[PDB]
């Protein structure tokens, strides 16, 4: 029971931008780890259809980055609606975590939570309200462990959801192994 309740729901999203009032989710991936960051199950890794007009009006940063990664083209070709994507992720976490008990995890994953609370509220209902923000640990590492901070793994920062989740886990594992108290 406690082991199940101590799992983590790792999620990373791509969005058309950071404006919660207009922007939409275009990519989502999800991994489950145990409390010790071992990957237990790989969830859906989905590209969500959104309208051409929204993609055409994205910021220059988003056009450049989602364009070169292939994501923009894949969004235009997608047949996955937001609602169907949500169901895939909700079904996955229902198979993997007890209801209400496990947190979202990722780098600045509160931004993903802001989008998910609005656009996948039933998925979020399965999760705790707390988060495991790897960037909180990053910012504490930078302050309290500046020497160790220089050794954190370099990120490819490809802005593709599943690859970025994996790098987030690796960053948190680095902090656990290097700035937390030794047993
Ligand atoms: Na992210």
Residue numbers in the entry: 4 to 186
Source paper text:
Among them, Oligoribonuclease (Orn) is unique as its activity is required for clearing short RNA fragments, which is important for cellular fitness. While other cellular RNases process oligoribonucleotides down to diribonucleotide entities, Orn is the one and only diribonucleotidase that completes the terminal step of RNA degradation. From this we propose a general model of RNA degradation, wherein a combination of exoribonucleases process oligoribonucleotides down to diribonucleotides and Orn completes RNA recycling by cleaving diribonucleotides to nucleoside monophosphates.
We initially determined the crystal structure of P. aeruginosa Orn (OrnPa) with diribonucleotide substrate; however, crystal packing contacts prevented substrate binding (data not shown). Residue numbering for REXO2 refers to its cytosolic isoform lacking the mitochondria-targeting pre-sequence. The corresponding residues, W64 and Y132, are conserved in REXO2. Most notably, residues S108, R130, S135 and the hydroxyl group on Y129 (S111, R133, S138, and Y132 in REXO2) form hydrogen bonds with the 5' phosphate of pGpG, capping the substrate.
